[PDB]
PDB file of C-alpha atoms in Angstrom:
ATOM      1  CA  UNK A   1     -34.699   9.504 -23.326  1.00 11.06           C
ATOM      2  CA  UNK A   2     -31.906   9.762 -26.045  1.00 12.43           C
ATOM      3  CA  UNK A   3     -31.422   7.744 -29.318  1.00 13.22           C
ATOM      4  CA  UNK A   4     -29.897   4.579 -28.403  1.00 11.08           C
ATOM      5  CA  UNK A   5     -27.405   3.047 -30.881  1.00 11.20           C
ATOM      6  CA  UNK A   6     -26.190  -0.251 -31.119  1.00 13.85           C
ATOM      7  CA  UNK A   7     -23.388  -1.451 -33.904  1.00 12.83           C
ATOM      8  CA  UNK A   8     -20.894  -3.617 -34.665  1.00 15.89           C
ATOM      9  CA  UNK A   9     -17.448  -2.866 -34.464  1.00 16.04           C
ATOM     10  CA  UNK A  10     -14.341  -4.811 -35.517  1.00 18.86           C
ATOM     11  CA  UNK A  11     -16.113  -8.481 -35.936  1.00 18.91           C
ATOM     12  CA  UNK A  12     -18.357  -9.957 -33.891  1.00 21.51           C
ATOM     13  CA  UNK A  13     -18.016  -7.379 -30.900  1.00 22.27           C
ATOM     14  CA  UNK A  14     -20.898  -4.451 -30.513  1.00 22.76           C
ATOM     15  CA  UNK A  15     -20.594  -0.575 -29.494  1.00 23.77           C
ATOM     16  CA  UNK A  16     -23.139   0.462 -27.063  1.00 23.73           C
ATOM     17  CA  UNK A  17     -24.106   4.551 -27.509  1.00 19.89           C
ATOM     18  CA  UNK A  18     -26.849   5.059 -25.172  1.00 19.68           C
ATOM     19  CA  UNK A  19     -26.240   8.943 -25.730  1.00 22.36           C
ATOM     20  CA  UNK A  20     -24.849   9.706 -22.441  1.00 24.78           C
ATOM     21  CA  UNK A  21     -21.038  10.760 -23.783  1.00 27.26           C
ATOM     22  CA  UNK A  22     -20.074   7.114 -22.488  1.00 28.37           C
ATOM     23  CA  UNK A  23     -18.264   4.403 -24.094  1.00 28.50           C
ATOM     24  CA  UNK A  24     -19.441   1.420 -23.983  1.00 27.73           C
ATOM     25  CA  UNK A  25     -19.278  -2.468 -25.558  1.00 29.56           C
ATOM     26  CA  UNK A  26     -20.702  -5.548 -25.280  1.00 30.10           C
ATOM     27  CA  UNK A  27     -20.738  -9.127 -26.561  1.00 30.33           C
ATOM     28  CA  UNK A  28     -23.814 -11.311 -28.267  1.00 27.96           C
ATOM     29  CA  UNK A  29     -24.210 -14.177 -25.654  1.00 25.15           C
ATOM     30  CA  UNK A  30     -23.867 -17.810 -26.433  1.00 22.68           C
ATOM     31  CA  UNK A  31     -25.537 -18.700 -23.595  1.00 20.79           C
ATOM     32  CA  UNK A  32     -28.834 -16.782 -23.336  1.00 21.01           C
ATOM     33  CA  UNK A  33     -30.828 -16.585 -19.221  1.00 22.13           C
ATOM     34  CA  UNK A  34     -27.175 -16.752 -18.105  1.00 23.84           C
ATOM     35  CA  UNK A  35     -25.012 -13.812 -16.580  1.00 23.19           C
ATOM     36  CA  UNK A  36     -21.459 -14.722 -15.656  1.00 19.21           C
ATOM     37  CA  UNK A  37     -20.370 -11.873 -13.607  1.00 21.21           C
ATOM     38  CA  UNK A  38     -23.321  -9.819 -13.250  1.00 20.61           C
ATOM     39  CA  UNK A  39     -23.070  -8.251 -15.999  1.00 22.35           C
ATOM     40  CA  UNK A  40     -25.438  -5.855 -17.557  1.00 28.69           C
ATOM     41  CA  UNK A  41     -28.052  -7.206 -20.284  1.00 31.48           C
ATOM     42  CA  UNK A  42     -29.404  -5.254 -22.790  1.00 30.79           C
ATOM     43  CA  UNK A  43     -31.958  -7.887 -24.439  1.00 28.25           C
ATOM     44  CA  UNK A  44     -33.565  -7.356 -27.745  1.00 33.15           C
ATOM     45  CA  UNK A  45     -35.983 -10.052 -28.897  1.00 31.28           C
ATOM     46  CA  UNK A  46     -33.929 -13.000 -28.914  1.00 30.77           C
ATOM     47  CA  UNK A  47     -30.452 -11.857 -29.002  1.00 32.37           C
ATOM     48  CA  UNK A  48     -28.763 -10.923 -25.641  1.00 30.41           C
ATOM     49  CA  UNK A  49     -26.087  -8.034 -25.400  1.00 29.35           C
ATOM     50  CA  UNK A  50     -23.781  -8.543 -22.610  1.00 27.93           C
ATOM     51  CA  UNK A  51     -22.191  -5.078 -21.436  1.00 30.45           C
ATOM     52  CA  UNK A  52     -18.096  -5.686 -21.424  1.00 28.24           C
ATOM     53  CA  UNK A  53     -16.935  -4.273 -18.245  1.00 28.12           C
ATOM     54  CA  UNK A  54     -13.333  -2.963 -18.558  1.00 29.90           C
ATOM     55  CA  UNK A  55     -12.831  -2.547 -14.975  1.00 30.48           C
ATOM     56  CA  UNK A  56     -13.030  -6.181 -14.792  1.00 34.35           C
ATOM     57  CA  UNK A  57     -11.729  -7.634 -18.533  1.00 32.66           C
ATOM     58  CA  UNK A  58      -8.532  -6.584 -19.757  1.00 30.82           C
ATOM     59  CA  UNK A  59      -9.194  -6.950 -23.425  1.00 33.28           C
ATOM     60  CA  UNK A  60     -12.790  -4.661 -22.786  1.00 33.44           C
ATOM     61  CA  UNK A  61      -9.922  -1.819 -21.289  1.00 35.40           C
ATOM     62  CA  UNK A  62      -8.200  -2.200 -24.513  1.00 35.00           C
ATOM     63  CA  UNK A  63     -10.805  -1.466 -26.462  1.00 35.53           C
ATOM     64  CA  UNK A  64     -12.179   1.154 -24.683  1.00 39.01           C
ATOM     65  CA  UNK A  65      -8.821   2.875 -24.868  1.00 40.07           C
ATOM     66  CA  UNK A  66      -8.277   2.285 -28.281  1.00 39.74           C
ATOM     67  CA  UNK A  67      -7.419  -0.806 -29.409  1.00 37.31           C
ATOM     68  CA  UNK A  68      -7.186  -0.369 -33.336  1.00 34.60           C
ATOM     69  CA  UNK A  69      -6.185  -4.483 -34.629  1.00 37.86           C
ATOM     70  CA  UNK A  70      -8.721  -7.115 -32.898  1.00 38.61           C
ATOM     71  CA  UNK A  71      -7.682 -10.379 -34.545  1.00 43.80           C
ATOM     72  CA  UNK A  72      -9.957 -12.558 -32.541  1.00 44.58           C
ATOM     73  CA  UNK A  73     -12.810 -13.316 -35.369  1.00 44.69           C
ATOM     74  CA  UNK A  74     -16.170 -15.476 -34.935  1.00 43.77           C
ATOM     75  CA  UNK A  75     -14.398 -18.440 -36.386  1.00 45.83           C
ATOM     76  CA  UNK A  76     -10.634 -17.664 -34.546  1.00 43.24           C
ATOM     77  CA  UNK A  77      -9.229 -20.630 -32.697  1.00 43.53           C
ATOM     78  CA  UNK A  78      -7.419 -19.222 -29.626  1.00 41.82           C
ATOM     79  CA  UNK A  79      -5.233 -20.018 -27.066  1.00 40.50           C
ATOM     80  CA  UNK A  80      -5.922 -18.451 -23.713  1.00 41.98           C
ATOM     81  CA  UNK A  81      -3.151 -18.087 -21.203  1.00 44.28           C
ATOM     82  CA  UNK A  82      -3.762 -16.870 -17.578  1.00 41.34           C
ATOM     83  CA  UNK A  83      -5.660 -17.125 -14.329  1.00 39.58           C
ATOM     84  CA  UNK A  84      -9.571 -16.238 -14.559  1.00 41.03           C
ATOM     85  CA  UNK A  85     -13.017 -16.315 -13.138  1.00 40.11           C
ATOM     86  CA  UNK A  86     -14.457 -16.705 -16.505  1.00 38.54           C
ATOM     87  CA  UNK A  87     -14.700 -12.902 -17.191  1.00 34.24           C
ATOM     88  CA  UNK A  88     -12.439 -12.140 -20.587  1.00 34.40           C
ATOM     89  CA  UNK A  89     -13.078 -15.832 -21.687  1.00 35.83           C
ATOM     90  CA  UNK A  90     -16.826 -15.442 -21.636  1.00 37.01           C
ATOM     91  CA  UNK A  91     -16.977 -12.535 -23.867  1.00 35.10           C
ATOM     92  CA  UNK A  92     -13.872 -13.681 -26.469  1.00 34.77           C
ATOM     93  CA  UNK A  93     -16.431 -17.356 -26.223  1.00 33.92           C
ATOM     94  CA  UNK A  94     -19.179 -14.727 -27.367  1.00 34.25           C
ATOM     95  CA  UNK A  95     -17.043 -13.547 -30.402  1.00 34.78           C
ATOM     96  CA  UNK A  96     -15.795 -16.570 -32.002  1.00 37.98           C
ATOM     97  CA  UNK A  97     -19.005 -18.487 -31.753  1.00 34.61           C
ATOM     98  CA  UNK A  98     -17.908 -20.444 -34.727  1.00 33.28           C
ATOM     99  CA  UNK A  99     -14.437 -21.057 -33.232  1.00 35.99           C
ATOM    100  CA  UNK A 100     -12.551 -22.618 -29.911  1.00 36.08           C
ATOM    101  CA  UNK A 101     -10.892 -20.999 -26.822  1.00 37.08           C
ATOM    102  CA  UNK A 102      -8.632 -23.582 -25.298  1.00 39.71           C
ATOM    103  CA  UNK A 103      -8.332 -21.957 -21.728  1.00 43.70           C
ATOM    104  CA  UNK A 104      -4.825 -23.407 -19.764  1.00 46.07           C
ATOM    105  CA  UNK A 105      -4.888 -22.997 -16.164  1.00 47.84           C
ATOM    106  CA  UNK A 106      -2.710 -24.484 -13.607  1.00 43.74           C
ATOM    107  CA  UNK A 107      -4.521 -24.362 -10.691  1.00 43.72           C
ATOM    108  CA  UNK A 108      -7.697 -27.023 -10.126  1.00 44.19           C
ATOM    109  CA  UNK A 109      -9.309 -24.342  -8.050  1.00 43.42           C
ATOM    110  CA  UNK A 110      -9.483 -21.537 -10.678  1.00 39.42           C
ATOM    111  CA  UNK A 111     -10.284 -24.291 -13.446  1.00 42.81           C
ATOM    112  CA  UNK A 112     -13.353 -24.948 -10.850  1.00 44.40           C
ATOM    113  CA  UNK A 113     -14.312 -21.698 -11.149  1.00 43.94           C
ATOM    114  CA  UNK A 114     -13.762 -20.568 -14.701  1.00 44.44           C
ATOM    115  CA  UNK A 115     -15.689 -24.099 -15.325  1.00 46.31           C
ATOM    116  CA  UNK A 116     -18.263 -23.309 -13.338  1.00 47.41           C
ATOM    117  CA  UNK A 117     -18.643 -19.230 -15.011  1.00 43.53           C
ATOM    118  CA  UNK A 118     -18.466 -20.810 -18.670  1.00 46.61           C
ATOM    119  CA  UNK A 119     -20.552 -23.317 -17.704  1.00 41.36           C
ATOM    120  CA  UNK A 120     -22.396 -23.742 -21.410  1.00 40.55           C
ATOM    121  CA  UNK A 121     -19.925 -22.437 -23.366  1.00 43.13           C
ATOM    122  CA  UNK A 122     -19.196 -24.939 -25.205  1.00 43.16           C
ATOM    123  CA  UNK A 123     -16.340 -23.294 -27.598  1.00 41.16           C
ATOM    124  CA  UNK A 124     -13.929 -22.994 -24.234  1.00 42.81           C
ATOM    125  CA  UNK A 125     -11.636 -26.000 -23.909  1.00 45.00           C
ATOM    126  CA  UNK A 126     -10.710 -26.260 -20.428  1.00 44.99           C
ATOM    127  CA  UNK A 127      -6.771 -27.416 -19.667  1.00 43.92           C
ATOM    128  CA  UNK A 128      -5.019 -27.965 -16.792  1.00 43.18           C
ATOM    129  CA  UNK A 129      -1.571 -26.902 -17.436  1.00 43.10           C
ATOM    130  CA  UNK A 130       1.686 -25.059 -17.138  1.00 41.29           C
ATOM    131  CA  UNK A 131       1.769 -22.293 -19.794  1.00 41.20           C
ATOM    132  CA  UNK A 132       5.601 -22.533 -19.489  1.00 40.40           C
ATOM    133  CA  UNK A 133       5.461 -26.370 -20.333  1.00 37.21           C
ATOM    134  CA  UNK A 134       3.552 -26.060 -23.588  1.00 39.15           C
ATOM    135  CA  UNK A 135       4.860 -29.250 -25.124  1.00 35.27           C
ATOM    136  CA  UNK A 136       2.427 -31.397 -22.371  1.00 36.02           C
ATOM    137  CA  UNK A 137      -1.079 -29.822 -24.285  1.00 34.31           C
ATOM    138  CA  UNK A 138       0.440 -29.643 -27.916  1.00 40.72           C
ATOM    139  CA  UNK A 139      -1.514 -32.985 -28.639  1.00 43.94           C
ATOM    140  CA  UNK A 140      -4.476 -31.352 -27.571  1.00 49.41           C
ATOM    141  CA  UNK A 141      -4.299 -27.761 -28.986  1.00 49.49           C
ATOM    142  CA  UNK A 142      -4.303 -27.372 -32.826  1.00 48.99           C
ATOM    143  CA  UNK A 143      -2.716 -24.799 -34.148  1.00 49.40           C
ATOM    144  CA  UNK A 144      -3.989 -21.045 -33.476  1.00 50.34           C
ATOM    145  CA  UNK A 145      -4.785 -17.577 -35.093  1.00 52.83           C
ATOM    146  CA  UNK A 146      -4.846 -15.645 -32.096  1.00 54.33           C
ATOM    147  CA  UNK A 147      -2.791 -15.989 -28.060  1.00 54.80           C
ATOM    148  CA  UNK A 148      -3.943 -14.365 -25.658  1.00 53.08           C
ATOM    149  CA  UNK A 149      -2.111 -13.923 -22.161  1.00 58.19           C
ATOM    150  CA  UNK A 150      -2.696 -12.403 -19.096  1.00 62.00           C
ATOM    151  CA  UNK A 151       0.377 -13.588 -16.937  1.00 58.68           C
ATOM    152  CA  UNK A 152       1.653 -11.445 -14.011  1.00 54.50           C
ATOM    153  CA  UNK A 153       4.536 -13.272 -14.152  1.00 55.29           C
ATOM    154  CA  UNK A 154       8.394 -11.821 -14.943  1.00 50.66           C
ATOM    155  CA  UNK A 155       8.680 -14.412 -17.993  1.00 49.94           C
ATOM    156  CA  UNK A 156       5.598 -13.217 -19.557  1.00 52.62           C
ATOM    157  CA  UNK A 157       7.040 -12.674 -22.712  1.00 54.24           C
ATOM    158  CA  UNK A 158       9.143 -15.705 -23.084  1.00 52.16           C
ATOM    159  CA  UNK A 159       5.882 -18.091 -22.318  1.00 53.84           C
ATOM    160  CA  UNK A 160       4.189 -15.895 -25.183  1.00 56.43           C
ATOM    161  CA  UNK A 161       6.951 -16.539 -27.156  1.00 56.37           C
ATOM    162  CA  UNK A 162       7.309 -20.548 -26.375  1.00 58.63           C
ATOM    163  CA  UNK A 163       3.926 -21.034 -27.057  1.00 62.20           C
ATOM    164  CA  UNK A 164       3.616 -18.577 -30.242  1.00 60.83           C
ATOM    165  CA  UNK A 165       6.840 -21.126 -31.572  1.00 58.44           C
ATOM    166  CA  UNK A 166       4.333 -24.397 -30.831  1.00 57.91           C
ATOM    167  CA  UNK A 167       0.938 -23.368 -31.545  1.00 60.75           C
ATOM    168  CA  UNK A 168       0.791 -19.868 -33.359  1.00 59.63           C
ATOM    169  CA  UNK A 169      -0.199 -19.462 -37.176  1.00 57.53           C
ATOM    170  CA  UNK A 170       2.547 -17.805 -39.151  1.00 55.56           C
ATOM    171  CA  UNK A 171       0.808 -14.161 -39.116  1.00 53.28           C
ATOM    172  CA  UNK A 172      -1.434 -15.113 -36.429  1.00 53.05           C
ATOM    173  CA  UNK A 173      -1.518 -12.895 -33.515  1.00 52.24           C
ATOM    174  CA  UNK A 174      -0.004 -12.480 -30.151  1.00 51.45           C
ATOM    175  CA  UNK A 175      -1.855 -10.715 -27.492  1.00 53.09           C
ATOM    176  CA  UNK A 176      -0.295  -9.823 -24.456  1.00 52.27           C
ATOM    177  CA  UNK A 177      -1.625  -7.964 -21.188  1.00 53.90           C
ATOM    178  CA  UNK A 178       1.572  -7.036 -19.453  1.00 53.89           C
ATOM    179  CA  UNK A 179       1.843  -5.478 -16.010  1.00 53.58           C
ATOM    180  CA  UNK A 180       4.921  -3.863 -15.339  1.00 53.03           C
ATOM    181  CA  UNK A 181       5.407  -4.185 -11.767  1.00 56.12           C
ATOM    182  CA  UNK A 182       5.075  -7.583 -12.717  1.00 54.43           C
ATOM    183  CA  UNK A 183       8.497  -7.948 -14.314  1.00 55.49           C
ATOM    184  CA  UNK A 184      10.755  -5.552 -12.144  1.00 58.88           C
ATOM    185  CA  UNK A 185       9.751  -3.291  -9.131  1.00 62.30           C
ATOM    186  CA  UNK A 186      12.970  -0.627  -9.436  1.00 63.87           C
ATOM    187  CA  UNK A 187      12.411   0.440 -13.216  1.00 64.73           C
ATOM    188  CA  UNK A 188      10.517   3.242 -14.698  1.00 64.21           C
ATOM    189  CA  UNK A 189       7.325   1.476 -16.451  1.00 64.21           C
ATOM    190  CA  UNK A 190       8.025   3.399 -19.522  1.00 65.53           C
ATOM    191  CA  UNK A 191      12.015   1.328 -19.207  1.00 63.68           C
ATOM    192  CA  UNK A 192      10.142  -1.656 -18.460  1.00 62.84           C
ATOM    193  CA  UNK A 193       7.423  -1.911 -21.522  1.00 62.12           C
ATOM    194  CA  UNK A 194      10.388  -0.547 -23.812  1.00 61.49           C
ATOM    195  CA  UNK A 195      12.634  -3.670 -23.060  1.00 61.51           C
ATOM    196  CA  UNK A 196       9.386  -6.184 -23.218  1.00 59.65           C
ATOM    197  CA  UNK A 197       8.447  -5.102 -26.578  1.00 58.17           C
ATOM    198  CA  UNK A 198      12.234  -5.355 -27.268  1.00 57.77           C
ATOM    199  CA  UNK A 199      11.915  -9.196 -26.124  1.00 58.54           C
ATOM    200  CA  UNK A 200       8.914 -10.000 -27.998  1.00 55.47           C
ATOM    201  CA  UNK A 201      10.305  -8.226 -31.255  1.00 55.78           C
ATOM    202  CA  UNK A 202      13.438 -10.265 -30.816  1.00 59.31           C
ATOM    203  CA  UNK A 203      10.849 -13.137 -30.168  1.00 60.00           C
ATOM    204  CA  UNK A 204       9.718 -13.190 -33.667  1.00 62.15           C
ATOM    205  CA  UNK A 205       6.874 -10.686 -33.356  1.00 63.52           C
ATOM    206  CA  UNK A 206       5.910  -7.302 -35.246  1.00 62.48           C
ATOM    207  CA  UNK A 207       4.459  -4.755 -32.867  1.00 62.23           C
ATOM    208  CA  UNK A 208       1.363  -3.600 -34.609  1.00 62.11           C
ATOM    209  CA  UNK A 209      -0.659  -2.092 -31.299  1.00 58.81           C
ATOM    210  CA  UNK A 210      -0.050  -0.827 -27.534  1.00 57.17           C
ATOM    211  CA  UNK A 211      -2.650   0.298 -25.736  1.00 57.31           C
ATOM    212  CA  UNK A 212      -2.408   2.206 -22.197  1.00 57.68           C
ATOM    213  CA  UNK A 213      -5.146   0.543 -20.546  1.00 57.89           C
ATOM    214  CA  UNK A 214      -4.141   3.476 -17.396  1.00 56.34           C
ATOM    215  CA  UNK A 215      -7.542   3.774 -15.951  1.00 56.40           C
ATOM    216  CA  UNK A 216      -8.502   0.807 -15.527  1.00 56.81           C
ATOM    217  CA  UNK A 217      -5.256  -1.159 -14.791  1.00 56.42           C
ATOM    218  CA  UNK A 218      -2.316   0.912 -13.255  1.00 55.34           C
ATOM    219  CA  UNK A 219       0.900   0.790 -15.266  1.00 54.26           C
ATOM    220  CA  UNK A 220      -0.750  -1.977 -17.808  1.00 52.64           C
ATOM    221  CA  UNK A 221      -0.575  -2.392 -20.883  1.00 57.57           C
ATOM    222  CA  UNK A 222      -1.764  -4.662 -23.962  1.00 57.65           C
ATOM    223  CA  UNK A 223       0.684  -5.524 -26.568  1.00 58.20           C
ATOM    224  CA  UNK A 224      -0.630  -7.045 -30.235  1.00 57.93           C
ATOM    225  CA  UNK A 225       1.815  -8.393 -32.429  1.00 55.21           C
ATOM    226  CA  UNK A 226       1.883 -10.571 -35.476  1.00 57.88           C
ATOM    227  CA  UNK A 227       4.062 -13.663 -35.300  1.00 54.63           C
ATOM    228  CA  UNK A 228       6.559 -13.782 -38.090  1.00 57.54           C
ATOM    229  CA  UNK A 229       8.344 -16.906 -36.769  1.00 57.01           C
ATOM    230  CA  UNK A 230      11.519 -17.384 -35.510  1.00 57.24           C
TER     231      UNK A 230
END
C-alpha cells in the first residue's frame, strides 16, 4: 500500500490522494448507513467520506478540472435549478450542513425521485416549480448566496439571470452548467459559450471562472460569476 491522504479543500469539500496519480473528492455525509447513488465510502470512525463521482455530478467535473472559486460554504443558502436524481444535490447537502438547498423541479416524477435519493437530508427544500416563473416560489425562498443551474435548455442564461434579479445576494454567486448543443446546434461551441458569457455579463454578472468540464461532459462547461445587480 501507499500513504493515503485525506484534506480539505475549498470549505467543507475533501481531496482524496490514495497515491495512485488519481484525482479524487468526496463529501462528509449528512446522512451516515446511506448511499445515494452507489457511491464509494471511505469510512473513518464515525465520519463517512462519500467519493464525488464527476462522471455523474457536474459540479464534481468542475472541480476535478479546476474549478478555482467554490462559493457554496457549510452555512450557504442555495438555490438549485435543474432536473436530478439526487446526485449533485446530495453532495452540495453534504457541504452546507449548516445551510439550505431549495431544489425546484417541475416535474412530480423527478421530485419523486430526487425525494426519494435525499431522503434524510433535511437541508434540501423540495419545490415544485417552473424555474422560468420564479415569482410563484419567491414567498418560499429567502434570499441566496449561491444559484446553481443545470438547465439544458436554450434560455439558460436568462432563467439564471431572472432568478439571480429575485433571489440572489448582491455579490452572491451564479453557477451555471451550460451545454452548448443545448442553445444552438449550427454554431461552433467556442461561438456559442462566447455569446452566453456575453448574456450573463450583460445580465449583471462578473465572470470570475470557466471550467472545461471536456471529459466528462462533451462541449460543457461551468460558468461562476458574481452578481453585481442589474
Amino acid at each position: 500500500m501507499e500513504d493515503i491522504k485525506i484534506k480539505e479543500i475549498f470549505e467543507n469539500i475533501y481531496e482524496v490522494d490514495l497515491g495512485d496519480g488519481l484525482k479524487r473528492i468526496a463529501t462528509k455525509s449528512i446522512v451516515k448507513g446511506k448511499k445515494v447513488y452507489d457511491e464509494k465510502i471511505i469510512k473513518i470512525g464515525d465520519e463517512e467520506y462519500r467519493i464525488w463521482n464527476p462522471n455523474k455530478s457536474k459540479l464534481a467535473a468542475a472541480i476535478i478540472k479546476g474549478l478555482k472559486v467554490m462559493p457554496i460554504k457549510r452555512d450557504s443558502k442555495i438555490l438549485y435549478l435543474g432536473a436530478s436524481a439526487g446526485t449533485t444535490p446530495s453532495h452540495v447537502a453534504d457541504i452546507a450542513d449548516k445551510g439550505i438547498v431549495y431544489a425546484i423541479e417541475y416535474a412530480p416524477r423527478i421530485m419523486r425521485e430526487l425525494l426519494d435519493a435525499c431522503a434524510e437530508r433535511e437541508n434540501i427544500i423540495p419545490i415544485l416549480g417552473d424555474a422560468n416563473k420564479p415569482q410563484e416560489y419567491a414567498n418560499i425562498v429567502e434570499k441566496v448566496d449561491v444559484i446553481y443551474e443545470d438547465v439544458a435548455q436554450p434560455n439558460q442564461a436568462e432563467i439564471l439571470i431572472k432568478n439571480a434579479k429575485w433571489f440572489l445576494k448582491k455579490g452572491g454567486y451564479g453557477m451555471i452548467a451550460i451545454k452548448a448543443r443545448s442553445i444552438d446546434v449550427t454554431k461552433d461551441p467556442k461561438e456559442i459559450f462566447k455569446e452566453q458569457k456575453e448574456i450573463l455579463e450583460a445580465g449583471g454578472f462578473k465572470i470570475v471562472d470557466e471550467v472545461d468540464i471536456e471529459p466528462f461532459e462533451k462541449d460543457h462547461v461551468m460558468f461562476v460569476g458574481i452578481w453585481e445587480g442589474k
